[PDB]
Amino acid sequence: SELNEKLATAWEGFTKGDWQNEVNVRDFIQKNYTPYEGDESFLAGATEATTTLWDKVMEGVKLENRTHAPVDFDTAVASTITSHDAGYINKQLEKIVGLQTEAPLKRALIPFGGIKMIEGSCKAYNRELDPMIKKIFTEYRKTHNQGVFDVYTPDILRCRKSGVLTGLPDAYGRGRIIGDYRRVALYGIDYLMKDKLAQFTSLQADLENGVNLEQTIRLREEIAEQHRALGQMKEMAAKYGYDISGPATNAQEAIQWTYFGYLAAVKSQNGAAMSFGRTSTFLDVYIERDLKAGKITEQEAQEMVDHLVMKLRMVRFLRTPEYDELFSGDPIWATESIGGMGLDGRTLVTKNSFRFLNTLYTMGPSPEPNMTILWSEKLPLNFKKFAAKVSIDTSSLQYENDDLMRPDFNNDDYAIACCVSPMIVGKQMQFFGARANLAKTMLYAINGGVDEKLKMQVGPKSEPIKGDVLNYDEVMERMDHFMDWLAKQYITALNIIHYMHDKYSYEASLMALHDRDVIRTMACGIAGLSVAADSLSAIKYAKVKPIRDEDGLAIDFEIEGEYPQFGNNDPRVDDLAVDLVERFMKKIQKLHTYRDAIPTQSVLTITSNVVYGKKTGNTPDGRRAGAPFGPGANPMHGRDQKGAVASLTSVAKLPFAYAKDGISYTFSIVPNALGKDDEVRKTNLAGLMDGYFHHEASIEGGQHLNVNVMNREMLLDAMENPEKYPQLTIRVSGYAVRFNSLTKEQQQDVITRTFTQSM
Amino acid sequence: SELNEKLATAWEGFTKGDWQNEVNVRDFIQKNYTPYEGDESFLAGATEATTTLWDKVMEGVKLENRTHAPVDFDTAVASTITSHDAGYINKQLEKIVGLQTEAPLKRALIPFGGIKMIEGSCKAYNRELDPMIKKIFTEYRKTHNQGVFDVYTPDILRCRKSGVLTGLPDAYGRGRIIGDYRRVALYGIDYLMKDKLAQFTSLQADLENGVNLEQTIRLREEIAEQHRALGQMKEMAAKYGYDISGPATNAQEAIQWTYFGYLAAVKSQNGAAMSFGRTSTFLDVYIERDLKAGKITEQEAQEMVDHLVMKLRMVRFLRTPEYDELFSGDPIWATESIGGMGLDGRTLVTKNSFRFLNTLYTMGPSPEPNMTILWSEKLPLNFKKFAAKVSIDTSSLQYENDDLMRPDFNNDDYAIACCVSPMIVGKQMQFFGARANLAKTMLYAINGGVDEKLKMQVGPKSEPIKGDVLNYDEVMERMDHFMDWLAKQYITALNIIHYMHDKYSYEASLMALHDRDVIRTMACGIAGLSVAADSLSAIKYAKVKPIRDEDGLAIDFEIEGEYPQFGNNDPRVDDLAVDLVERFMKKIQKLHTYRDAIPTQSVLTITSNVVYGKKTGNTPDGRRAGAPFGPGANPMHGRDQKGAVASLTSVAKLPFAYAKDGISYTFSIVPNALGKDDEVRKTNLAGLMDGYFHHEASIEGGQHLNVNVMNREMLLDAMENPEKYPQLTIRVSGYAVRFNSLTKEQQQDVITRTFTQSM
Ligand SMILES: CC(C)(COP(=O)(O)OP(=O)(O)OC[C@H]1O[C@@H](n2cnc3c(N)ncnc32)[C@H](O)[C@@H]1OP(=O)(O)O)[C@@H](O)C(=O)NCCC(=O)NCCS
Ligand SMILES: CC(C)(COP(=O)(O)OP(=O)(O)OC[C@H]1O[C@@H](n2cnc3c(N)ncnc32)[C@H](O)[C@@H]1OP(=O)(O)O)[C@@H](O)C(=O)NCCC(=O)NCCS
Ligand SMILES: OC[C@H](O)[C@@H](O)CO
Ligand SMILES: OC[C@H](O)[C@@H](O)CO
Ligand SMILES: OC[C@H](O)[C@@H](O)CO
Ligand SMILES: OC[C@H](O)[C@@H](O)CO
Ligand SMILES: [Mg+2]
Ligand SMILES: [Mg+2]
Ligand code: NA
Ligand code: NA
Ligand code: NA
Ligand code: NA
Ligand code: NA
Ligand code: NA
Ligand code: NA
Ligand code: NA
Ligand code: NA
Ligand code: NA
Ligand code: NA
Ligand code: NA
Ligand code: NA
Ligand code: NA
């Protein structure tokens, strides 16, 4: 209660409010940002420095893509916020600085999560691990991975081996946490440390009085670790020549300070998704102030945004080949949520919303950061059209429904973590759960719990379904049974994982940038939704005959008659998909969870569509053994054949009400199907999204849309001549990848997906 | 359910029972031991090997005592069960092998408990800590000490600084855990590992069903760590050339296997007390079988016992000078519980009970192991007299009331941890709490919570007592108030400490030798009982006038009139002491504890009588500022002036019912007061103990008695000429020390205590 000079100088001219007396970034934004309803005509192009820097870094990116391996990585240093010396691309040119290690794209060792994974990476990429690192993290500091495997059950291990529940966060950082990095810029580290000491002290009475004793002790230790991490952030920044004890005083510092908060996160944790947040409009407050004061020019502002975004394009983590199969394309999910509307009806689009999108022109297409447009039917048309143009030109953006999510939270300061999972910034996080194989679960119902590939009893022993023709009611009754079992094994695995991750790899630097009490959801994903829905549809509307082996195991199916497939706006099958989503949500909702994290569901797969597909045999819908499932909530490859409106309609029917962790849809449309020329294409794409996301009391609308605007012929050319397309980026599951970063098998999945040929 | 050949061979001839089908050491003992009612005439003397070995080790002991520092210690190795190579005194001579490090008396670094303490020891003893050890245990593996200090409150820190609650286990291993080391001998490691996997598996249903989720996950991880520690025990033993996968097959192996279980404990944990258990009668089963088979001679049996006991005399831990003030004399508390009676009325005294006592003759007096006689009025007179003779000759034994403790537990297989704290072996442990300063708490009541030395507000702000004469009712009402506050701060500190010790230094190798579910008590000790009781007595029966400074602070007292002092069998003051014990027990009983550990109390101080005394000003009883309190439950120095029966009577009145963690009494009697000659002295000492420990429905009896039989003139000679008394041992607080191991200040405390001059 008395702002020192540091705060005074930094906050000069800002509209006053609660944000000056307590940590409240949303209040600061609301009182200070400038809504922008204009067009992209004010945008500046790249400076020579930006191009020199990015062109150099791209040589490392090309090396990564051609070798499908890291440019370099540590073999003898355990990474922490302060372990590495300052690293640069070219110190004379960078306006925003900071790298994870001492060299661009060199990956770190983050051992707290597990030592076996590091050993696996060293073997895979032909480097020798320092014996000391192995010793420390085997005998002295236990890891998250070992804690989990020490407590797992034989049943969970069988599910992992068989492909019914695989790829969970037992061997990589859980992620799904977004510290509010904007807090570093707004308040400075010292203010945040004082606030954390107050939070710590506020728990003393409960501790002394024996109120929720263990929970209170745990939280006090976590806050002490958060406070320690904040101090370490100052030391890290000082290595780069910056004193971040006080608040940022100008645009360059606001961008730099925010990035430093994020840099501490990616130097200390290797979460699968390390998302950036909802920062562009916040940063516009500082940029606008400097532009009006004549302190910086628009080109200088674009340059600072470019250098920040360039650093987000350089975040890297050492991963194993196994991880690469589950999360393809060397992803980071440095997700940035752009635009949206405020609860007061004003748009949250700012000139900076345009500057962030402009990085796809100043430095070309790029998969990271994962730029996510928070769409509203009320967004300024100028912005709707520019975003559509950027999608048409680069296929690098995704869109999510602000008209659905803002009212659901009654909050206009939520951000997207990873692909499609919303959280109020600094107040909420998710316990990541990857996803379960719903399609294989259906086969288990038909086969009495016996795996169709391993011929091992994995699910509970049950009587396999008999007869030469499958009956929908019977199959669905057994499937419901196995969904109960799946939910229990899944939540049990996640309870173990998150208990161990809190114990052995607590994300102190990210949690330090959250309120004292954070809302946690237990995010359960489902893979193979359209395979399961179409399988049920074939059984219900056609005649499906099981082909059994000498043991009675259904290893194939013959289908007589046509049946409705998901993605063609046919309620007969779409209703089955909606039902499966509701059904699984209701089952996980009944189970006890670690830290009482609220169960939620997402229809999302990342590359588990390929991994689970490889481990799943022939299914009733006609899909062949080993074939990929569709990505996320997508109709199976090529089955949506009635056009864009029809497939968008089928997907929009899936209920966000029962899948609050998100519903991913990857939409690819050929240029000429989208429109006759550029202007018409922009108008039509904005129109398609307005219809898909349309929300009213009786219509939920879709929640997410990846948009690719390309001809399949071009991707085939890139498969044959990768050198011609070094920056070619494509949306694939709720994030983007450089097409050349994928393995051939992953490219085959992508090229056989639906390329929509009509409205 | 099918004993392999390993078990068959090892158990040949033993009486069958439950012990062969489940881990049940008590059942094995009950069905196989041979009660011995004879005398000491069968005992053999030392072999040349034993004398050669012990004489060599004693040179290291003399070096420790003269330098008051370790002979040597590690500066670059973090100790674990397998870290050190095999070490020997003289491999050609040892019948029982195993040392903590690679050299006799060389102390280890056990960093999991804290790195600052290690830094403190290195500085104090002039050795340089390896930078790598400091780095690992500051940045990679957090320690118990740092976890505690990260969560402590400013109030607890003020209590620690002021001397009202100091010396708690926030900077050293908590100890008070006795794994059942006999299990290694009886079953072998493989059988115990299979049993632990079954215990782990038995928790799967609760885990899956969400029953006490966090508790279940925690216990499963603990059992996995226990299983891992058992495997490490096999590797440790193999370094010494032994395969302990199967059960011990003869006496030498039973002793060796039991010792290996203990060796793993003292290589991995540095608990203040690392007690041995109740092993002598168990080991007699194997010795008796070999003697009857003619496999070994009695002298060979004594030699194996001697070599085992010699190793217990060599256990060492690196401690700081601060620790040395609180726990003087380089103590280990390798406590062994001898004799006692079974629930069936048979004595549990065996020939081995005599062999253990005989080590005080074969290798001379020694403070460790801490041999504790479980006394019963029904013990064979031959044993009562031999134990009395050993006390008369060596002052190295203590006695505890089996007639009180066995019926309290309805169990005849409990052992004493540290000094006086009983636990059923393998089924119970204590969360150690050190002790609180009850005397200073009384001054706080008189001074409104302000510390009499620091002039700082430590206790809650309260109105200091006014007037020129203190009133008992008023003082007691305020004291009760401050006892409530003390209890809450104490239990809060212990809740933090034990949560952190379970997290950062879980005693896996010891817990591996316990049942799945262990009963835990939260052991709270009180120091200064007789100072507080006598202060209340002076106030109540005499006229006590406070001497106040310019601030109204009572810094001294003048007493007009005589008043009854504790230890003279005067109910007027003894009732006050009994009341204080009951009062504090009732207050801690109301508080919530970590892991729902049952609060218990002990009247025990170790050297906190000196440390708290130094930090406590003048008290109402007349004790001067800085003077030591009495040890444990002892009357203040020299105040028990009516003889042995009178002081034993006062102490026996203290209620074990309200101090289940134990009540320590150190009794020293001059030889001629005890009896005219040797035979009379033995008879009289046994008679005094029979009376003190006498128990019936209406008489509890005393719980513990340290017995010193010496002339003060002899101790004065030892203070002046230590070289003349290298093995001189004396009981001091519930354990023994070599007199030469004490600092001069600690010796001054000891020499000014009461030397009883009459019955
Ligand atoms: C080693 C262990 C995992 C079982 O090993 P297993 O019989 O080979 O198990 P699986 O066949 O299911 O294989 C384990 C899989 O997890 C992988 N893995 C990842 N981290 C691992 C870790 N820390 N330890 C072991 N395996 C690990 C293995 O590489 C393997 O992957 P794969 O199927 O692609 O080859 C054992 O720790 C275990 O059974 N744990 C369960 C809990 C338990 O028993 N605790 C001890 C109780 S006393
Ligand atoms: C460093 C800290 C202990 C306070 O230090 P301080 O102001 O010097 O405290 P005190 O004066 O009471 O001294 C601490 C005593 O504990 C000792 N100590 C033992 N282990 C220690 C450890 N890990 N850290 C600090 N002191 C330690 C110190 O040496 C000192 O002993 P002394 O009184 O004989 O000199 C600080 O960690 C603290 O206040 N912790 C309480 C919890 C807290 O604030 N957590 C962070 C919340 S965001
Ligand atoms: O070696 C036993 C250790 O506790 C290990 O499990 C973690 O470091
Ligand atoms: O280590 C890099 C990964 O192997 C690659 O798949 C990323 O495209
Ligand atoms: O190793 C424990 C430390 O507190 C670490 O978590 C931060 O440096
Ligand atoms: O390190 C040994 C201790 O300093 C000594 O007090 C033991 O007698
Ligand atoms: Mg395996
Ligand atoms: Mg201090
Ligand atoms: Na290039
Ligand atoms: Na770190
Ligand atoms: Na860390
Ligand atoms: Na907790
Ligand atoms: Na729920
Ligand atoms: Na919907
Ligand atoms: Na349209
Ligand atoms: Na000697
Ligand atoms: Na160890
Ligand atoms: Na350990
Ligand atoms: Na627990
Ligand atoms: Na109680
Ligand atoms: Na008593
Ligand atoms: Na007597």
Side-chain angles (χ1 to χ4, degrees), chain B residues 404 651-657 663 699-703:
Chain B
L404 172 63
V651 174
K653 280 186 159 188
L654 297 180
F656 181 62
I663 300 170
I699 303 173
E700 200 181 66
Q703 187 254 345

Side-chain angles (χ1 to χ4, degrees), chain A residues 138-142, chain B residues 225 228 232:
Chain A
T138 295
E139 302 183 50
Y140 309 146
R141 173 54 150 79
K142 190 170 186 179
Chain B
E225 284 282 322
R228 175 173 290 118
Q232 289 171 5

